[PDB]
Amino acid sequence: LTPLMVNGILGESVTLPLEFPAGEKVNFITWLFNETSLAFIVPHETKSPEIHVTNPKQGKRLNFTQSYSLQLSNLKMEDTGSYRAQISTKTSAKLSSYTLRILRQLRNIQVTNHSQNMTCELHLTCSVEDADDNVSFRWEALGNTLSSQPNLTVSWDPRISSEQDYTCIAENAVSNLSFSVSAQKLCE
Amino acid sequence: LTPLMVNGILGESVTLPLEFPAGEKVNFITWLFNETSLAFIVPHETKSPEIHVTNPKQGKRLNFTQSYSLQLSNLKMEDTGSYRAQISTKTSAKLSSYTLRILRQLRNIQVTNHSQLFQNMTCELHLTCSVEDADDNVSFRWEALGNTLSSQPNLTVSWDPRISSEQDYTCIAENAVSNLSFSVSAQKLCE
Numbered sequence: 097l098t099p100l101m102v103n104g105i106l107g108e109s110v111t112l113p114l115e116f117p118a119g120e121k122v123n124f125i126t127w128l129f130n131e132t133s134l135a136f137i138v139p140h141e142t143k144s145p146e147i148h149v150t151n152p153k154q155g156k157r158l159n160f161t162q163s164y165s166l167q168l169s170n171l172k173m174e175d176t177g178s179y180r181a182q183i184s185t186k187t188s189a190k191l192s193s194y195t196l197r198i199l200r201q202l203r204n205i206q207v208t209n210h211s212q213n214m215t216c217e218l219h220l221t222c223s224v225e226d227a228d229d230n231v232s233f234r235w236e237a238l239g240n241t242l243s244s245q246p247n248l249t250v251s252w253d254p255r256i257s258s259e260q261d262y263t264c265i266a267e268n269a270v271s272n273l274s275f276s277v278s279a280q281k282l283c284e
Numbered sequence: 285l286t287p288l289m290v291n292g293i294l295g296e297s298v299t300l301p302l303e304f305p306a307g308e309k310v311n312f313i314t315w316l317f318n319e320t321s322l323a324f325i326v327p328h329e330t331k332s333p334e335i336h337v338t339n340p341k342q343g344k345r346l347n348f349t350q351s352y353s354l355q356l357s358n359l360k361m362e363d364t365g366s367y368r369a370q371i372s373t374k375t376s377a378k379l380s381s382y383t384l385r386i387l388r389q390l391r392n393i394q395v396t397n398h399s400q401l402f403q404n405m406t407c408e409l410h411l412t413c414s415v416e417d418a419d420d421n422v423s424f425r426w427e428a429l430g431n432t433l434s435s436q437p438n439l440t441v442s443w444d445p446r447i448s449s450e451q452d453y454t455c456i457a458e459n460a461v462s463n464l465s466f467s468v469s470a471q472k473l474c475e
């Protein structure tokens with residue numbers, strides 16, 4: 097039961113949906129973050145629950161649902177990490193694990209070229225802003241993948257090359273951008 | 285940040301002491317074990333504490349001093365690992381880390397004789413010391429007449445009744461938490 101991978105957007109909010117199977121009576125629930133604890137929760141049927149925030153900082157931007165799912169708002173980079181819900185029953189203490197990732201939304205996708213004759217050879221590079229190591233590019237023509245990197249170099253002959261355009265697609269877990277360029281324009 | 289290495293003996297107990305306040309005041313304490321939480325403690329300076337244990341695995345085995353120091357009794361191998369105390373002040377949550385290693389007592393020490401079969405009065409002995417199960421952590425040393433003659437299992441001596449006196453070669457095995465000692469006599473081994 098390895099960690100559920102969830103993606104938060106920098107600046108915005110996110111919920112880690114604490115769930116079951118259960119069956120036995122929950123006595124407590126603890127929300128853990130990395131080495132540390134975030135929140136202690138004594139659930140109650142009749143009453144509101146007693147909630148104890150054990151981690152000052154994060155805690156400012158921290159709330160809980162009717163079901164004790166973690167709600168984290170105005171997400172920061174230092175928010176990334178392993179979150180875990182420990183449902184302390186009377187004979188067991190099972191863990192739900194999440195991996196929270198925080199990424200800026202991709203913006204400003206751009207394409208530049210670097211160079212006649214009858215046969216045209218283009219050197220294309222796709223760039224983006226607010227990238228990370230976990231961005232990923234690919235160049236596509238007619239639904240075919242010419243390249244899986246920001247760099248594409250291809251030959252284009254107006255009179256036998258079947259495609260007429262090249263399209264860069266840049267995406268991460270929360271962004272999907274694309275720019276396309278015209279051989280017939282990039283080759284004079 | 286350290287953490288503080290602690291040696292528990294299998295089947296015995298061990299506490300883990302806390303350090304505060306040095307200034308701030310604690311609203312709660314959380315004792316953590318590896319991936320999980322063990323206990324939430326809500327102290328009352330003015331009264332008694334509210335101790336919600338969050339991991340029942342540790343049965344009657346888990347306990348807390350008047351000082352909210354964690355104490356585990358009848359330790360098992362499964363207790364090995366990291367314990368952290370999260371002391372929640374208003375403005376932060378500092379951790380006292382511990383790493384608890386569970387060692388077993390040494391049982392059954394043995395000396396074995398790898399000498400030559402027939403002894404020629406000018407007697408030469410190759411002995412070697414053992415413990416029931418060898419661990420990287422076990423340390424041997426031999427002693428005779430107040431002199432330490434080795435710092436490993438093996439011992440080579442020589443002995444001649446005509447000039448050397450009667451004495452016992454004594455192995456001593458030990459690890460962090462315990463020790464044993466067996467002692468053969470030269471007169472016996474050499475005949």
Ligand SMILES: [Ca+2]
Nearest residue numbers: 159160161162
């Ligand atoms: Ca709420």
